[PDB]
Amino acid sequence: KKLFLKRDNLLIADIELGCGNFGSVRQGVYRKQIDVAIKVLKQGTEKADTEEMMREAQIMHQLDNPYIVRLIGVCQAEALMLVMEMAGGGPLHKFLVGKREEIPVSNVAELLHQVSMGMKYLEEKNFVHRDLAARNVLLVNRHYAKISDFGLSKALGADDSYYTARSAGKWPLKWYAPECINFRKFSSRSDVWSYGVTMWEALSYGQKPYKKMKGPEVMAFIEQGKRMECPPECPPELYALMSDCWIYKWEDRPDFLTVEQRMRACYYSLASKVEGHHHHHH
């Protein structure tokens, strides 16, 4: 619990990166002066919400990976605040919109590959993210992606899954595996399903999943043995991969150990056909 920071080393700018009911995420700097994102709990917060962020803060402290937003520490001042590294690029989906001629598929597969490495790591640490989606993948730059928002993250321990309570609000159904909707059961393979939707979102350059559907309109679809089409120009090997990520039976769905290895091959294949180059994570 040496994770507390000095309010004085933190300058919070009047810049909001995102928001929501929990409060807002703002940009600032922390002492040289590293850029940081600050999750500030709403002013009128409650024990429950303060405990959650506190648990969230605790989970992030256990994670040490390049493809995951790092926790700088927690700061208790005029409000409870989660201070974590900054990913200036922003969300993967808003980033890819209208950029099919700027960001080739090889670059998209690069970012998706990095995400698969982060999740492989998460799986090993037996943590379930639950909210993996393009909007929660943040870019440091165009060749460096990071998984963020561990607000719904949870440790599994010896268990390979858990049944969650139902909190007020709506569920991002289009990103949930069948067993998540029918039995509220979550696991790594559940994150794999979300990873598959994430691949689709990215490979389709920012489009919304099941665009035109909503609610039980989606589950009925999946139930019948149907899924999203192959995005335009997405290589067969990639689609075969995201498709396998949508295997109904939990037991028959690949784990991140296999997804990463498969995503790695699909990526290096494309990358080996590109002209020019960039650097490591840059």
Tab-separated table of C-alpha atoms in Angstrom:
chain	number	residue	atom	x	y	z
A	1	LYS	CA	0.000	0.000	0.000
A	2	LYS	CA	2.924	2.287	-0.791
A	3	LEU	CA	0.720	3.267	-3.736
A	4	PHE	CA	-0.285	6.691	-2.392
A	5	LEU	CA	0.859	9.844	-4.203
A	6	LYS	CA	1.548	13.407	-3.024
A	7	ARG	CA	-1.242	15.677	-4.226
A	8	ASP	CA	1.476	18.319	-4.737
A	9	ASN	CA	3.248	16.345	-7.468
A	10	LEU	CA	0.027	16.245	-9.487
A	11	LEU	CA	-1.127	19.049	-11.764
A	12	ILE	CA	-4.636	18.403	-13.099
A	13	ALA	CA	-5.466	20.234	-16.326
A	14	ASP	CA	-8.907	21.443	-17.380
A	15	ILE	CA	-8.937	18.739	-20.022
A	16	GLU	CA	-11.406	15.900	-19.912
A	17	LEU	CA	-10.455	12.709	-21.745
A	18	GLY	CA	-13.711	10.927	-21.018
A	19	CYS	CA	-16.403	10.742	-18.353
A	20	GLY	CA	-19.447	8.852	-17.128
A	21	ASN	CA	-21.390	8.401	-13.897
A	22	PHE	CA	-18.319	7.355	-11.861
A	23	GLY	CA	-17.049	10.868	-12.527
A	24	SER	CA	-14.542	11.948	-15.167
A	25	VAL	CA	-11.093	11.155	-16.536
A	26	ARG	CA	-8.823	14.173	-16.864
A	27	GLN	CA	-5.359	14.810	-18.203
A	28	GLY	CA	-2.502	16.200	-16.155
A	29	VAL	CA	1.136	15.705	-15.253
A	30	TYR	CA	2.846	14.074	-12.292
A	31	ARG	CA	6.395	14.598	-11.012
A	32	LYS	CA	10.312	14.831	-14.497
A	33	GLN	CA	6.676	15.525	-15.389
A	34	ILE	CA	5.092	12.453	-16.922
A	35	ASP	CA	1.788	12.928	-18.677
A	36	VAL	CA	-1.000	11.185	-16.822
A	37	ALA	CA	-4.698	10.417	-17.014
A	38	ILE	CA	-6.605	11.025	-13.798
A	39	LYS	CA	-9.781	9.149	-12.940
A	40	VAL	CA	-11.546	11.474	-10.482
A	41	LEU	CA	-14.523	10.070	-8.593
A	42	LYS	CA	-17.658	12.235	-8.666
A	43	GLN	CA	-17.762	14.668	-5.728
A	44	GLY	CA	-20.766	12.997	-4.113
A	45	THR	CA	-19.338	9.476	-3.964
A	46	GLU	CA	-20.179	6.565	-1.658
A	47	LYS	CA	-18.183	3.967	0.263
A	48	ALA	CA	-19.119	1.287	-2.283
A	49	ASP	CA	-17.758	3.309	-5.208
A	50	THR	CA	-14.658	4.282	-3.221
A	51	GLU	CA	-14.041	0.622	-2.422
A	52	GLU	CA	-14.394	-0.368	-6.064
A	53	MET	CA	-11.860	2.123	-7.382
A	54	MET	CA	-9.674	1.054	-4.482
A	55	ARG	CA	-9.970	-2.576	-5.599
A	56	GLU	CA	-9.383	-1.474	-9.196
A	57	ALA	CA	-6.266	0.373	-8.034
A	58	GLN	CA	-5.151	-2.831	-6.318
A	59	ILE	CA	-5.618	-5.019	-9.393
A	60	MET	CA	-3.637	-2.666	-11.624
A	61	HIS	CA	-0.768	-2.667	-9.129
A	62	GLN	CA	-0.340	-6.400	-9.762
A	63	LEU	CA	-0.086	-5.980	-13.536
A	64	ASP	CA	3.277	-5.378	-15.193
A	65	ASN	CA	2.978	-5.457	-18.979
A	66	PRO	CA	3.750	-3.112	-21.918
A	67	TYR	CA	0.300	-3.582	-23.467
A	68	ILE	CA	-1.684	-2.506	-20.407
A	69	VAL	CA	-2.174	1.042	-19.072
A	70	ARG	CA	0.037	1.336	-16.002
A	71	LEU	CA	-1.118	2.585	-12.614
A	72	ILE	CA	1.024	5.418	-11.323
A	73	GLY	CA	-0.593	5.381	-7.921
A	74	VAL	CA	-3.677	6.584	-6.089
A	75	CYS	CA	-4.148	10.082	-4.740
A	76	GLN	CA	-6.485	10.990	-1.923
A	77	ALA	CA	-7.036	14.744	-1.908
A	78	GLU	CA	-10.086	16.872	-2.688
A	79	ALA	CA	-11.337	13.582	-4.113
A	80	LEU	CA	-10.320	9.965	-4.621
A	81	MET	CA	-8.273	9.767	-7.817
A	82	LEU	CA	-6.750	6.994	-9.890
A	83	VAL	CA	-3.567	8.307	-11.500
A	84	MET	CA	-2.315	6.231	-14.411
A	85	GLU	CA	-0.069	6.634	-17.444
A	86	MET	CA	-1.366	8.582	-20.439
A	87	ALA	CA	-2.059	7.170	-23.914
A	88	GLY	CA	-2.366	10.317	-26.012
A	89	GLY	CA	-3.482	8.525	-29.151
A	90	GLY	CA	-6.852	7.787	-27.594
A	91	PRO	CA	-9.406	4.978	-28.262
A	92	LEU	CA	-8.647	2.440	-30.993
A	93	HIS	CA	-12.058	2.747	-32.677
A	94	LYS	CA	-12.284	6.544	-32.966
A	95	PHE	CA	-8.668	6.345	-34.129
A	96	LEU	CA	-9.317	4.000	-37.058
A	97	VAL	CA	-12.414	5.803	-38.382
A	98	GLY	CA	-11.927	7.015	-41.940
A	99	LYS	CA	-8.308	5.858	-42.062
A	100	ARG	CA	-8.331	2.801	-44.325
A	101	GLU	CA	-5.900	4.642	-46.632
A	102	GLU	CA	-3.656	5.786	-43.796
A	103	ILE	CA	-3.475	2.729	-41.545
A	104	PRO	CA	-3.011	-0.486	-43.529
A	105	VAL	CA	-4.287	-3.863	-42.345
A	106	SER	CA	-0.727	-4.794	-41.362
A	107	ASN	CA	-0.728	-1.920	-38.894
A	108	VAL	CA	-4.155	-2.875	-37.581
A	109	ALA	CA	-2.993	-6.437	-37.045
A	110	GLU	CA	0.050	-5.024	-35.243
A	111	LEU	CA	-2.134	-3.281	-32.682
A	112	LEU	CA	-4.487	-6.268	-32.384
A	113	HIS	CA	-1.456	-8.454	-31.858
A	114	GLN	CA	-0.267	-6.247	-29.009
A	115	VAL	CA	-3.710	-6.422	-27.459
A	116	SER	CA	-3.587	-10.215	-27.704
A	117	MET	CA	-0.250	-10.208	-25.860
A	118	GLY	CA	-1.687	-8.084	-23.069
A	119	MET	CA	-4.688	-10.404	-22.681
A	120	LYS	CA	-2.439	-13.494	-22.803
A	121	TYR	CA	-0.624	-11.932	-19.884
A	122	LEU	CA	-3.905	-11.138	-18.093
A	123	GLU	CA	-5.018	-14.738	-18.562
A	124	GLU	CA	-1.772	-15.988	-16.985
A	125	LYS	CA	-2.311	-13.689	-14.004
A	126	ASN	CA	-5.829	-15.163	-13.930
A	127	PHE	CA	-7.597	-11.819	-14.226
A	128	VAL	CA	-10.798	-11.360	-16.185
A	129	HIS	CA	-11.120	-7.963	-17.846
A	130	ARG	CA	-14.767	-8.244	-18.925
A	131	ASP	CA	-14.873	-4.927	-20.739
A	132	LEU	CA	-12.380	-5.529	-23.565
A	133	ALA	CA	-13.612	-3.538	-26.589
A	134	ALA	CA	-12.123	-1.140	-29.159
A	135	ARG	CA	-13.189	1.866	-27.082
A	136	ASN	CA	-11.074	0.569	-24.192
A	137	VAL	CA	-7.938	-0.061	-26.206
A	138	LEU	CA	-5.803	3.077	-26.053
A	139	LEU	CA	-2.965	4.066	-28.373
A	140	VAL	CA	0.307	5.677	-27.258
A	141	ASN	CA	0.963	6.082	-30.973
A	142	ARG	CA	-0.073	4.209	-34.123
A	143	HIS	CA	2.256	1.310	-33.315
A	144	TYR	CA	1.682	1.020	-29.581
A	145	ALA	CA	-1.629	-0.079	-28.054
A	146	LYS	CA	-2.626	-0.529	-24.418
A	147	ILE	CA	-5.554	-2.239	-22.741
A	148	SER	CA	-7.229	0.085	-20.232
A	149	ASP	CA	-10.131	0.496	-17.800
A	150	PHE	CA	-9.882	-2.335	-15.273
A	151	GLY	CA	-12.991	-1.057	-13.504
A	152	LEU	CA	-14.879	-4.308	-13.998
A	153	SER	CA	-11.760	-6.464	-13.735
A	154	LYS	CA	-11.771	-9.276	-11.215
A	155	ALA	CA	-9.406	-11.954	-9.938
A	156	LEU	CA	-10.385	-15.589	-10.424
A	157	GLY	CA	-7.944	-17.301	-8.109
A	158	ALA	CA	-8.164	-21.071	-8.513
A	159	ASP	CA	-11.537	-20.693	-10.220
A	160	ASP	CA	-11.663	-20.411	-14.004
A	161	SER	CA	-14.809	-18.294	-13.955
A	162	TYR	CA	-17.273	-16.439	-11.748
A	163	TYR	CA	-20.919	-15.449	-11.785
A	164	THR	CA	-21.363	-11.732	-11.388
A	165	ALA	CA	-24.000	-9.854	-9.490
A	166	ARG	CA	-26.142	-7.647	-11.720
A	167	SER	CA	-25.602	-3.944	-11.147
A	168	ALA	CA	-28.025	-1.213	-12.209
A	169	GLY	CA	-27.590	-0.048	-15.787
A	170	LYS	CA	-27.184	-1.757	-19.151
A	171	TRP	CA	-24.803	-4.454	-20.343
A	172	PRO	CA	-22.680	-3.985	-23.479
A	173	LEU	CA	-24.377	-7.078	-24.909
A	174	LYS	CA	-22.723	-6.942	-28.337
A	175	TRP	CA	-19.391	-7.702	-26.605
A	176	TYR	CA	-20.582	-10.549	-24.321
A	177	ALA	CA	-20.269	-14.287	-24.917
A	178	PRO	CA	-23.419	-16.459	-24.718
A	179	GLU	CA	-22.644	-17.852	-21.277
A	180	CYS	CA	-22.286	-14.216	-20.112
A	181	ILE	CA	-25.803	-13.292	-21.126
A	182	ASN	CA	-27.596	-16.526	-20.242
A	183	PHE	CA	-25.762	-17.390	-17.041
A	184	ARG	CA	-23.823	-14.262	-16.077
A	185	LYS	CA	-20.633	-16.391	-16.181
A	186	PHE	CA	-17.305	-14.610	-16.875
A	187	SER	CA	-13.814	-15.886	-17.606
A	188	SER	CA	-10.728	-15.519	-19.812
A	189	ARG	CA	-12.499	-17.281	-22.660
A	190	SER	CA	-15.207	-14.716	-22.132
A	191	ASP	CA	-12.611	-11.993	-22.734
A	192	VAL	CA	-11.635	-13.943	-25.861
A	193	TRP	CA	-15.156	-13.465	-27.216
A	194	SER	CA	-14.803	-9.716	-26.503
A	195	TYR	CA	-11.390	-9.837	-28.152
A	196	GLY	CA	-13.025	-11.274	-31.272
A	197	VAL	CA	-15.524	-8.413	-31.389
A	198	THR	CA	-12.603	-6.037	-30.846
A	199	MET	CA	-10.814	-7.553	-33.885
A	200	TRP	CA	-13.915	-6.948	-35.954
A	201	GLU	CA	-14.268	-3.367	-34.721
A	202	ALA	CA	-10.650	-2.648	-35.608
A	203	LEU	CA	-10.493	-4.573	-38.873
A	204	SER	CA	-13.686	-2.800	-39.988
A	205	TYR	CA	-12.090	0.553	-39.144
A	206	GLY	CA	-14.330	1.795	-36.355
A	207	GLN	CA	-17.703	0.352	-37.249
A	208	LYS	CA	-20.207	-0.671	-34.602
A	209	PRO	CA	-20.855	-4.399	-34.034
A	210	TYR	CA	-24.265	-5.682	-35.097
A	211	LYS	CA	-25.072	-2.260	-36.515
A	212	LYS	CA	-28.896	-2.146	-36.860
A	213	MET	CA	-29.589	-4.656	-34.083
A	214	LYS	CA	-30.010	-4.290	-30.319
A	215	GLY	CA	-30.996	-6.284	-27.240
A	216	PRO	CA	-32.291	-9.879	-27.820
A	217	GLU	CA	-31.994	-9.193	-31.541
A	218	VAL	CA	-28.296	-9.994	-31.134
A	219	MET	CA	-28.595	-13.114	-28.974
A	220	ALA	CA	-31.183	-14.641	-31.305
A	221	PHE	CA	-28.660	-14.070	-34.099
A	222	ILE	CA	-25.749	-15.739	-32.318
A	223	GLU	CA	-28.011	-18.528	-31.058
A	224	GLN	CA	-28.927	-19.542	-34.623
A	225	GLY	CA	-25.299	-20.089	-35.598
A	226	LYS	CA	-24.715	-16.726	-37.211
A	227	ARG	CA	-22.109	-14.024	-36.726
A	228	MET	CA	-20.736	-10.810	-38.114
A	229	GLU	CA	-19.479	-10.957	-41.661
A	230	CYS	CA	-15.831	-10.777	-42.592
A	231	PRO	CA	-14.938	-7.080	-42.680
A	232	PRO	CA	-14.000	-5.797	-46.143
A	233	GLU	CA	-10.372	-6.615	-46.978
A	234	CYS	CA	-9.794	-8.629	-43.795
A	235	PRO	CA	-7.527	-11.620	-44.579
A	236	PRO	CA	-9.184	-15.084	-44.205
A	237	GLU	CA	-6.698	-16.128	-41.498
A	238	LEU	CA	-7.658	-13.093	-39.422
A	239	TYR	CA	-11.392	-13.653	-39.858
A	240	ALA	CA	-10.956	-17.372	-39.109
A	241	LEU	CA	-9.313	-16.242	-35.886
A	242	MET	CA	-11.913	-13.728	-34.737
A	243	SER	CA	-14.552	-16.253	-35.812
A	244	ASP	CA	-13.045	-18.972	-33.620
A	245	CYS	CA	-13.138	-16.404	-30.804
A	246	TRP	CA	-16.911	-16.644	-31.210
A	247	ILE	CA	-17.241	-20.406	-30.735
A	248	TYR	CA	-20.456	-20.877	-28.732
A	249	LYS	CA	-19.341	-23.633	-26.374
A	250	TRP	CA	-17.159	-22.137	-23.670
A	251	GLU	CA	-15.231	-25.423	-23.530
A	252	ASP	CA	-14.442	-25.323	-27.249
A	253	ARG	CA	-13.371	-21.661	-27.392
A	254	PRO	CA	-9.653	-20.907	-27.686
A	255	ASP	CA	-7.723	-19.316	-24.848
A	256	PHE	CA	-5.420	-16.319	-25.202
A	257	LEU	CA	-2.399	-18.619	-25.241
A	258	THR	CA	-3.660	-19.920	-28.598
A	259	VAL	CA	-5.155	-16.620	-29.858
A	260	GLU	CA	-1.870	-14.761	-29.313
A	261	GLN	CA	0.146	-17.417	-31.085
A	262	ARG	CA	-2.348	-17.364	-33.971
A	263	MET	CA	-2.556	-13.558	-34.020
A	264	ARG	CA	1.267	-13.450	-33.999
A	265	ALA	CA	1.490	-15.566	-37.169
A	266	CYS	CA	-1.255	-13.641	-38.976
A	267	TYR	CA	0.521	-10.408	-38.107
A	268	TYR	CA	4.092	-11.309	-39.104
A	269	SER	CA	2.739	-12.727	-42.362
A	270	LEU	CA	1.160	-9.396	-43.335
A	271	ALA	CA	4.029	-7.334	-41.916
A	272	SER	CA	6.550	-9.296	-43.986
A	273	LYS	CA	4.891	-7.956	-47.141
A	274	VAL	CA	5.048	-4.282	-46.223
A	275	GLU	CA	7.442	-1.726	-47.734
A	276	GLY	CA	9.299	0.690	-45.464
A	277	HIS	CA	9.244	0.425	-41.678
A	278	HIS	CA	8.825	1.850	-38.183
A	279	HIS	CA	10.415	1.131	-34.809
A	280	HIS	CA	9.691	-0.954	-31.716
A	281	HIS	CA	6.466	0.405	-30.175
A	282	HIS	CA	7.168	3.568	-32.162
